[PDB]
Short mmCIF file of C-alpha atoms in Angstrom, two decimals:
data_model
loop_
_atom_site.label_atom_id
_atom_site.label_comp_id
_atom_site.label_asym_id
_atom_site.label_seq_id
_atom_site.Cartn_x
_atom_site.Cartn_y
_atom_site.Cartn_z
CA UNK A 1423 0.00 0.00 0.00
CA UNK A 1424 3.47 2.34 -0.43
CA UNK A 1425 4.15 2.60 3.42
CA UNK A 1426 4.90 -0.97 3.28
CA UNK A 1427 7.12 -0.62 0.89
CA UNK A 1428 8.42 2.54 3.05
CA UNK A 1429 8.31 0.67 6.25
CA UNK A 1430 9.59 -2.66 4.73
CA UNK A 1431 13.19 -0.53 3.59
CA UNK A 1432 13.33 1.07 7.08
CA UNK A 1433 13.30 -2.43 8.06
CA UNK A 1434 15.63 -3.55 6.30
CA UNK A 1435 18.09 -0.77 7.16
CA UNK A 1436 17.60 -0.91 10.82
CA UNK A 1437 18.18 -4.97 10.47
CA UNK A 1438 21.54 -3.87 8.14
CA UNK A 1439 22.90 -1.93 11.14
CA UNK A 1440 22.19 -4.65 13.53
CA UNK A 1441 24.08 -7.40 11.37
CA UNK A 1442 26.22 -5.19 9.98
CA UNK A 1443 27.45 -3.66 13.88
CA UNK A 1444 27.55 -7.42 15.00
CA UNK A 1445 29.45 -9.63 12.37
CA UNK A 1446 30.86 -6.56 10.25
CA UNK A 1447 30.36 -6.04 6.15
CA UNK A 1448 32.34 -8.49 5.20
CA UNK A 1449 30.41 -11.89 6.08
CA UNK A 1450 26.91 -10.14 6.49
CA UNK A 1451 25.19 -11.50 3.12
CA UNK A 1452 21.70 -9.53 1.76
CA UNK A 1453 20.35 -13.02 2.98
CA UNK A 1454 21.03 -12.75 6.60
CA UNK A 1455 19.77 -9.61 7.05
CA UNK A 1456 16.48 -10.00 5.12
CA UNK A 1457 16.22 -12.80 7.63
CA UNK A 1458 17.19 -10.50 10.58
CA UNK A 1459 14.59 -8.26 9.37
CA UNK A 1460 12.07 -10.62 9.01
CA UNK A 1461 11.16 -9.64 6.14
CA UNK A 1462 10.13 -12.32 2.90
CA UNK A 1463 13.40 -12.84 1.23
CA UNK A 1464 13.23 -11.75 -2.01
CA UNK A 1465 11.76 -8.78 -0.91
CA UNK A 1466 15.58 -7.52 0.05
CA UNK A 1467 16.37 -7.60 -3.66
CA UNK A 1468 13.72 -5.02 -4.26
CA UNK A 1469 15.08 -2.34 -2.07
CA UNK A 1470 18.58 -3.18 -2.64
CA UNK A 1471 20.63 -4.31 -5.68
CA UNK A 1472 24.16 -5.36 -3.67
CA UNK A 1473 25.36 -4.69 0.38
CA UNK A 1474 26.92 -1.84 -1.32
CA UNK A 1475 23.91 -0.24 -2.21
CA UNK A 1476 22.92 -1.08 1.32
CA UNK A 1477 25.94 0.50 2.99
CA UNK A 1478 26.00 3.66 1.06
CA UNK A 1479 22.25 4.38 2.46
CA UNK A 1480 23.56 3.68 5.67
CA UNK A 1481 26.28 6.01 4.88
CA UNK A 1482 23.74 8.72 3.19
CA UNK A 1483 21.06 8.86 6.65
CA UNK A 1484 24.04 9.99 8.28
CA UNK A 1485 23.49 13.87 6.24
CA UNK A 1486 19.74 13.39 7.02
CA UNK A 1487 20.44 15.26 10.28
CA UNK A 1488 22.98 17.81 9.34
CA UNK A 1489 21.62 19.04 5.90
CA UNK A 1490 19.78 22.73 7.45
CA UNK A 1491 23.02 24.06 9.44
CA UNK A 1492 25.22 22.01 6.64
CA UNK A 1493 23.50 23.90 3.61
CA UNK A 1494 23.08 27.36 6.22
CA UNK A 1495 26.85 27.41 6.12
CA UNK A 1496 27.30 26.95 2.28
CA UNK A 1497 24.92 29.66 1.26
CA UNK A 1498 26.78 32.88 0.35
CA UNK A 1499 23.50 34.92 1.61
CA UNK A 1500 24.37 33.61 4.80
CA UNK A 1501 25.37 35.72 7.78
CA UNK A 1502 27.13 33.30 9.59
CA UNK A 1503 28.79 30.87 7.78
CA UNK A 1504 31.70 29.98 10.16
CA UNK A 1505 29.08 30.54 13.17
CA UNK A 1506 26.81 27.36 11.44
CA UNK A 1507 29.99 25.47 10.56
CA UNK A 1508 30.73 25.54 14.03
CA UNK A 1509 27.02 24.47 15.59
CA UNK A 1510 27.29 21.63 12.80
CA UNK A 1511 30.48 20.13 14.08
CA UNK A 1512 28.66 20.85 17.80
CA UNK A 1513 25.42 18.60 16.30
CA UNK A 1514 27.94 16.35 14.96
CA UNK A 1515 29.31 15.31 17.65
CA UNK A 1516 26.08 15.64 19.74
CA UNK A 1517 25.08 12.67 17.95
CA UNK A 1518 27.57 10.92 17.55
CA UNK A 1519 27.68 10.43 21.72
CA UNK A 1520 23.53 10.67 22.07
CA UNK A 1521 22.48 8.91 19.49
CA UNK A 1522 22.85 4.95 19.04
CA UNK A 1523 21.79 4.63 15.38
CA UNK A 1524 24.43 7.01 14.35
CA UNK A 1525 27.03 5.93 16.87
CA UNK A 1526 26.31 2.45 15.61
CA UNK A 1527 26.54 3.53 11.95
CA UNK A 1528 29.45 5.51 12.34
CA UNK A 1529 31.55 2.38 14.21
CA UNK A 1530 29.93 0.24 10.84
CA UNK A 1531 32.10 2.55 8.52
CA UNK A 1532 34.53 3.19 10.57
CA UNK A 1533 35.96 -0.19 12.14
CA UNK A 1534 33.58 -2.51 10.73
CA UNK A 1535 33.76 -2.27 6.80
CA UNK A 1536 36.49 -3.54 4.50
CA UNK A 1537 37.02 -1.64 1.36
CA UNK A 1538 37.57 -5.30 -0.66
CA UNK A 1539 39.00 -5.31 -4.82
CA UNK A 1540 36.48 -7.72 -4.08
CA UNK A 1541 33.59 -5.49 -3.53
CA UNK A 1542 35.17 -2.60 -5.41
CA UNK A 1543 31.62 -0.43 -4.83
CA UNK A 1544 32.97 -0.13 -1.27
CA UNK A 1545 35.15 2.20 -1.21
CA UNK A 1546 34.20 3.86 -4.48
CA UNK A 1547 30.91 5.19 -2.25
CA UNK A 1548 33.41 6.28 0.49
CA UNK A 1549 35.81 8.13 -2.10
CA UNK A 1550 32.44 10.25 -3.52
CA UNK A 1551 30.91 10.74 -0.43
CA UNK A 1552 34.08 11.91 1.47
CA UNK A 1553 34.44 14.35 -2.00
CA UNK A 1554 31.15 15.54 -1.74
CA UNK A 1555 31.72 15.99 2.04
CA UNK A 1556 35.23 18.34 1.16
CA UNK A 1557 33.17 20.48 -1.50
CA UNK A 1558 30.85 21.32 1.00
CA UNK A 1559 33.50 22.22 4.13
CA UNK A 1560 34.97 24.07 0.90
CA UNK A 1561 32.01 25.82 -0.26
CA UNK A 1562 31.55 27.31 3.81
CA UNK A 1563 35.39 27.90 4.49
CA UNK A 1564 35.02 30.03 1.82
CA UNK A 1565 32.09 31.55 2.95
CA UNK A 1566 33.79 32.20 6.20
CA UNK A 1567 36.72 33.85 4.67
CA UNK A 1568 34.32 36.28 2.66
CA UNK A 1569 32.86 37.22 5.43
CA UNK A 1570 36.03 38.22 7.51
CA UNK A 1571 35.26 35.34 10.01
CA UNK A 1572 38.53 33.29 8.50
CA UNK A 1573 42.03 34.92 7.40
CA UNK A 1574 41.85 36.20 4.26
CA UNK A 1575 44.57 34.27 2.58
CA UNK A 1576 43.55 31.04 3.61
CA UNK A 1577 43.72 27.62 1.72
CA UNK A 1578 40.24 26.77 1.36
CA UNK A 1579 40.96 23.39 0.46
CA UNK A 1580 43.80 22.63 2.69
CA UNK A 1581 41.89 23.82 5.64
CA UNK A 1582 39.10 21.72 5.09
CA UNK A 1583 41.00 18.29 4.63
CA UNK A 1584 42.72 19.43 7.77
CA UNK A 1585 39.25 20.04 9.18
CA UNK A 1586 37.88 17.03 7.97
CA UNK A 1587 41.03 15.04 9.00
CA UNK A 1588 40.61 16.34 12.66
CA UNK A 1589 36.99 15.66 12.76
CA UNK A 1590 37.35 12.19 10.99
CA UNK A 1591 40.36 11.35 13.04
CA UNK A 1592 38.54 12.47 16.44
CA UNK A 1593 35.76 10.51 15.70
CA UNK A 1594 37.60 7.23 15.45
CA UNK A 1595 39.39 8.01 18.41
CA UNK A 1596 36.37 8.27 20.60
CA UNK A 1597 34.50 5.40 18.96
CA UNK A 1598 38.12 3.15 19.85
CA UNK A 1599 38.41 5.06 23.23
CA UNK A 1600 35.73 6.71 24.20
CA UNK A 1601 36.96 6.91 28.10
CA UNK A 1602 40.07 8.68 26.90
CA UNK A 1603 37.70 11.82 25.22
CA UNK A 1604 34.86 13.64 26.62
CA UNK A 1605 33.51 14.16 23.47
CA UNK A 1606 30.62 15.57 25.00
CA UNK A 1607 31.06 16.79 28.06
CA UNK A 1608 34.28 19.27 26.22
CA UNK A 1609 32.27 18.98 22.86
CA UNK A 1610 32.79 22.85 22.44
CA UNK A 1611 36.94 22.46 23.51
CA UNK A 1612 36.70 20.01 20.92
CA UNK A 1613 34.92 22.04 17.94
CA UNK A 1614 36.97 25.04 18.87
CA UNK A 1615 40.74 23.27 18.79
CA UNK A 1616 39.74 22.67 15.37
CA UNK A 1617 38.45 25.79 13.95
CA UNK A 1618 41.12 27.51 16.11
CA UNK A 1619 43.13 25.06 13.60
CA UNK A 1620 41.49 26.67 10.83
CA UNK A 1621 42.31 30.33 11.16
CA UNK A 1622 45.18 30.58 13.80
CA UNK A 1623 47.37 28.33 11.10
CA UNK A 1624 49.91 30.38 9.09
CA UNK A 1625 51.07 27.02 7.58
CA UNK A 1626 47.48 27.05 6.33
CA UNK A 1627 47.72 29.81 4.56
CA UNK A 1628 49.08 30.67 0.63
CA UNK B 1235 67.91 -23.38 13.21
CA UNK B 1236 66.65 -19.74 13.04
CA UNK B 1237 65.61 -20.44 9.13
CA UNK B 1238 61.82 -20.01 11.46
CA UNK B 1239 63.32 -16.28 10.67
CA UNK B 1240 63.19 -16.70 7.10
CA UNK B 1241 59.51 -18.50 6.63
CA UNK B 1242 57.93 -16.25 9.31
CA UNK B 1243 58.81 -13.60 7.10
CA UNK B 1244 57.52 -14.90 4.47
CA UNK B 1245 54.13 -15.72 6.08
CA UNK B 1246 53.81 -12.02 6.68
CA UNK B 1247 54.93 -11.08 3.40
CA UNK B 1248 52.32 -13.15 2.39
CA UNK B 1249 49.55 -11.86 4.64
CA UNK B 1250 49.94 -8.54 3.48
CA UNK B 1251 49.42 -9.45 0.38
CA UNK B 1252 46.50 -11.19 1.11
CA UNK B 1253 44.76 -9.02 3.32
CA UNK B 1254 45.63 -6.01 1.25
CA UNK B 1255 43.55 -7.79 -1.73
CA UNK B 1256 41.12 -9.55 -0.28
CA UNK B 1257 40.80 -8.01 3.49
CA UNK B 1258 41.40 -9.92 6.68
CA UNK B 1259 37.82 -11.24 7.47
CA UNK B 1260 37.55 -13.94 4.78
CA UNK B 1261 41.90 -14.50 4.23
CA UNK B 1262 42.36 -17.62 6.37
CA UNK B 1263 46.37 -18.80 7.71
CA UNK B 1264 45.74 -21.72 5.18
CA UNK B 1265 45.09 -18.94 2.41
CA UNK B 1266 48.13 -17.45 3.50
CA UNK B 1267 50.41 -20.42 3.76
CA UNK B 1268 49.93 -21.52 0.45
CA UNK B 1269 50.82 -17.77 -1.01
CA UNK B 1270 53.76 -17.52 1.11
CA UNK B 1271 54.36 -21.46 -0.40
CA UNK B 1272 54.56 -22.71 3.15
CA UNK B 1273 52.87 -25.75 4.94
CA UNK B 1274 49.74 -25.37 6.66
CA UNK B 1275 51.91 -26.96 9.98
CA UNK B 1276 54.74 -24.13 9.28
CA UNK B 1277 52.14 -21.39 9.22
CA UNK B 1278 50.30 -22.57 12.35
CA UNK B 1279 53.76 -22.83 14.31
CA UNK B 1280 54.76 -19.48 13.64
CA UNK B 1281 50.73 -18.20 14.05
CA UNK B 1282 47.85 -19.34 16.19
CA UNK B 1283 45.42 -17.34 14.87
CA UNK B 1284 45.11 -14.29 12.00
CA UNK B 1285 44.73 -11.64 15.06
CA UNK B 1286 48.71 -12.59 15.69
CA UNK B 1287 49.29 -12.08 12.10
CA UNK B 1288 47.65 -8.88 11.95
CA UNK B 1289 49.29 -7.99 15.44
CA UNK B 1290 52.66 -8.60 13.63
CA UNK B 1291 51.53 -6.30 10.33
CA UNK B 1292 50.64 -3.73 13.20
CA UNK B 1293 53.60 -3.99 15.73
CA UNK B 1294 55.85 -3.62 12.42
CA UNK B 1295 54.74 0.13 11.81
CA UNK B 1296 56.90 1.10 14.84
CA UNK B 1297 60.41 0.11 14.29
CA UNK B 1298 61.37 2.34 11.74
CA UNK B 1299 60.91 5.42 14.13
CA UNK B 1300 61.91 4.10 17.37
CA UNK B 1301 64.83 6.19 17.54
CA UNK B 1302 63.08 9.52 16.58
CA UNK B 1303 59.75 8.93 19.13
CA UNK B 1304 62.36 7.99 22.07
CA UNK B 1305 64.09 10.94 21.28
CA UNK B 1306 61.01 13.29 21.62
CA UNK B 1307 60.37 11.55 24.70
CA UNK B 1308 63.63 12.11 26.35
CA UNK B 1309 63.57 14.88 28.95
CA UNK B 1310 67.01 15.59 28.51
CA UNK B 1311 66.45 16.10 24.68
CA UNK B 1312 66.65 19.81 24.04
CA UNK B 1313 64.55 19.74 20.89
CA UNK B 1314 61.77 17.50 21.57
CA UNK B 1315 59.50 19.56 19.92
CA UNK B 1316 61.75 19.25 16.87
CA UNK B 1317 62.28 15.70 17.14
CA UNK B 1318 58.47 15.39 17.02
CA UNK B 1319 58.07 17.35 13.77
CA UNK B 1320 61.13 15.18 12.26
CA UNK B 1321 59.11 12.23 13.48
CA UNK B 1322 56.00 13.50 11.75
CA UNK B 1323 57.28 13.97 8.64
CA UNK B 1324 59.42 10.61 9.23
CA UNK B 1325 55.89 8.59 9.57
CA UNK B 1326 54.40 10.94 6.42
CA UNK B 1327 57.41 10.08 4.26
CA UNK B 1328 57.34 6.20 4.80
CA UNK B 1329 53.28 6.10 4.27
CA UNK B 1330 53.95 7.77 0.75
CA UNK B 1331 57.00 5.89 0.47
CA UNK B 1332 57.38 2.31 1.67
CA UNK B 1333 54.77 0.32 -0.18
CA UNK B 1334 54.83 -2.09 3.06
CA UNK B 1335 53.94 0.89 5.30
CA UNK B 1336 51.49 1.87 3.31
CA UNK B 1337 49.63 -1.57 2.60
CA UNK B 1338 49.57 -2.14 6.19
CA UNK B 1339 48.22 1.06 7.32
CA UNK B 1340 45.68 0.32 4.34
CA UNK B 1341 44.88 -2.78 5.96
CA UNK B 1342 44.40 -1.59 9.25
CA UNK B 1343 42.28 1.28 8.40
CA UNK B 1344 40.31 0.19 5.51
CA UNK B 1345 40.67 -3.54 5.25
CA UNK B 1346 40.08 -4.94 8.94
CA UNK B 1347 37.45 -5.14 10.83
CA UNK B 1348 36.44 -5.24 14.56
CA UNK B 1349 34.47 -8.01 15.01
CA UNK B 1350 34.19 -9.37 18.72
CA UNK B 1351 34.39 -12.62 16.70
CA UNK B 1352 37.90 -11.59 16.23
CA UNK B 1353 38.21 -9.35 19.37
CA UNK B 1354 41.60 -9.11 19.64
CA UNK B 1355 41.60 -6.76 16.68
CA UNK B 1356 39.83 -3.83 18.81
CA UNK B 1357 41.46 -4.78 22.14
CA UNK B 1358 45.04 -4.64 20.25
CA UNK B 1359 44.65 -1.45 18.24
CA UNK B 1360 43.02 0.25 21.81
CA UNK B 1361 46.82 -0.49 23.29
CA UNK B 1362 49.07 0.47 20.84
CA UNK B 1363 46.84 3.74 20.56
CA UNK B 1364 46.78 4.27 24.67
CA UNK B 1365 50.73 3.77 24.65
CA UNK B 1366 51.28 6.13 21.13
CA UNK B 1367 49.49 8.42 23.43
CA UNK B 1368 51.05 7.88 26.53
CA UNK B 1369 54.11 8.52 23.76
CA UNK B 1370 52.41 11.86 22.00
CA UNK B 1371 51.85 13.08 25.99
CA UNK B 1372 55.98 12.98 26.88
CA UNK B 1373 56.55 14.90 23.48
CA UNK B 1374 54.55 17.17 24.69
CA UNK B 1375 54.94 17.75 27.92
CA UNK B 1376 58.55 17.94 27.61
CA UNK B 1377 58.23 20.53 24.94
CA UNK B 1378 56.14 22.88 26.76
CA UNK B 1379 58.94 22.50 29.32
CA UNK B 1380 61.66 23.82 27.28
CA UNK B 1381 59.35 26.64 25.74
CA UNK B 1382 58.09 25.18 22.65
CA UNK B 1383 54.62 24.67 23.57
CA UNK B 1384 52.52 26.77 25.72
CA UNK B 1385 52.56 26.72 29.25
CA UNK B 1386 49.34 26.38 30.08
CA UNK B 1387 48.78 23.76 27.09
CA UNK B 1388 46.51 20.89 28.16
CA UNK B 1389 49.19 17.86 27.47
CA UNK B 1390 46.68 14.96 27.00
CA UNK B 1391 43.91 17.32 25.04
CA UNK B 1392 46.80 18.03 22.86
CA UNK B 1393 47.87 15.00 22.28
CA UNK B 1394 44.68 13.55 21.05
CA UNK B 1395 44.02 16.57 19.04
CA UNK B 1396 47.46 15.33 17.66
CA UNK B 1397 46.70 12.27 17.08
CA UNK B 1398 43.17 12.54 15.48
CA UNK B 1399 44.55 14.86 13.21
CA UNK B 1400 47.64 12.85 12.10
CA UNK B 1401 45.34 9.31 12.27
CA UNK B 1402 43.00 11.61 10.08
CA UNK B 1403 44.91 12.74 7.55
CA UNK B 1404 46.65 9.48 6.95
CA UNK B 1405 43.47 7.60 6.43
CA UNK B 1406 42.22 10.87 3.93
CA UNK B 1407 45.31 9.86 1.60
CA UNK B 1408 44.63 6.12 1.42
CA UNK B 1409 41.15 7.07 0.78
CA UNK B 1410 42.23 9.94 -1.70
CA UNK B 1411 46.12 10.03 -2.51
CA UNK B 1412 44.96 13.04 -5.15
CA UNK B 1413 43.69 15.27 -2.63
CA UNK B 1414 46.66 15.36 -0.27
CA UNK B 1415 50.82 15.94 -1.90
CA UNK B 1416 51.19 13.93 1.67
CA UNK B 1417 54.87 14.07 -0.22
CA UNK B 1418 55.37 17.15 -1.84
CA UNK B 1419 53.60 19.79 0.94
CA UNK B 1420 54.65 17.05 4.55
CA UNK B 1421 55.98 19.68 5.74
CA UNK B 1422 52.98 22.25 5.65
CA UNK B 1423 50.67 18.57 6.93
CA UNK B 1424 53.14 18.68 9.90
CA UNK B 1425 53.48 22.01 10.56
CA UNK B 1426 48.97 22.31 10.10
CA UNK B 1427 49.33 20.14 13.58
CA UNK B 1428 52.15 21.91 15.08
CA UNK B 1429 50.18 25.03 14.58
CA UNK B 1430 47.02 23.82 15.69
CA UNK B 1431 48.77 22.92 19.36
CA UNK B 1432 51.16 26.11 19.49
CA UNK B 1433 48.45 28.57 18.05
CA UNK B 1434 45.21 27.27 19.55
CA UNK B 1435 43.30 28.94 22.94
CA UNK B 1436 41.20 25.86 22.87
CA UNK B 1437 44.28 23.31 23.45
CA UNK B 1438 44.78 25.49 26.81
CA UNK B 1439 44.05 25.75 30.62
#
């Protein structure tokens, strides 16, 4: 009746995470999560070509959240740019450390995921989505630096793998050790050290 | 006779190899003894499991910059802070470098996964990540000691900030080698992290 097709997919995405959290990508087959999500089996192959397909939505509902502060600090007519940059990175991490489904997710791509020659569609999704990911911390860098809020000669592109880097490489850190960060409780130490990064650096600059 | 030296290095010759193409989760030892042409009995002699194997790819990184790291770490080392910026672009110069390096830190970020059916994974990367730090921390420490880093710099904050961006950046150029002269502009990568510690309010008390 179209929600169950709507509901069915949700299904099968929650059972994905679930499987894929448990016994990682590698050895999770379409099969044992259709069965995990009790759902018919061919039905699966309906929402779903490949696990890739599967991952990358996995992958994709982790923008869902962002997109309003995330496309806030891309828009030129914005005010603010490098103010919603930084409440992004704050929401960011807010979820990461409240939220199970994208804690859960994020430990799936993270630790939890092999990028096989095997399954070559793998790491291809991770290569475009980590792209379209650095356009966008471009696009607001940029933004900031128009605005005055970031040093005038800075490398927009530099700055935001750096950014990105820090981020990504924070991220992993807490989900290996989480007792060794208070991600949350120094969540705004944490979002600052890296903007701070961003227009305090003269090696960042041209 | 120590010819175990020779076909243990083989094995993890071959395990690279392996796990580099077809990731550590579905290469089994008896996958790997037969591409390193050894017997299934000389493989399991030398390895009980893949999670010593992948321990061995792991513990490997280290060796080359042993001498640099203790040197950081030395309180009587004038320089540390230099020694840890000659360190930094020591570990960002092998990664582009040494294919071995750089298939193994390929396999450990992009080819391995935690599974608690293979716990020892997680539990072994969480050590050698709590001593690097305990590692990054001396550096540190001693540098703001000799006037190199703030006073007031928060030592352990730092240090993961450090690391994260370092552990970050690495895992951006096996991801995307195109998008990061790791080689050509190290030294402006290094000196982004250096910055970020020396220049940054945040990283403070």
């Amino acid at each position: 009746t179209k929600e169950e097709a709507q509901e069915t997919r949700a299904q099968i995405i929650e059972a994905a995470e679930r499987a894929f959290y448990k016994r990682g990508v590698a050895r999770t087959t379409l099969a044992d999560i259709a069965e995990l999500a009790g759902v018919t089996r061919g039905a699966i192959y309906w929402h779903f070509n490949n696990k890739a397909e599967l991952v990358q939505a996995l992958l994709d509902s982790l923008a869902e959240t962002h997109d309003h502060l995330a496309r806030a600090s891309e828009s030129e007519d914005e005010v603010d740019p490098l103010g919603c940059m930084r409440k992004l990175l704050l929401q960011v991490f807010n979820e990461l450390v409240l939220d199970a489904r994208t804690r859960r997710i994020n430990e799936i791509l993270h630790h939890k995921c092999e990028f096989t020659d095997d399954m070559c569609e793998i790491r291809q999704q991770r290569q475009s989505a980590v792209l379209d990911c650095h356009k966008g911390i471009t696009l607001a860098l940029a933004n900031a630096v128009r605005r005055g809020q970031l040093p005038g000669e800075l490398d927009a592109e530099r700055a935001a793998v750096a950014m990105f880097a820090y981020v990504d490489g924070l991220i992993r850190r807490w989900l290996l050790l989480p007792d060794s960060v208070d991600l949350l409780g120094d969540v705004e130490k944490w979002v600052d050290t890296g903007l701070d990064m961003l227009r305090l650096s003269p090696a960042l600059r041209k």
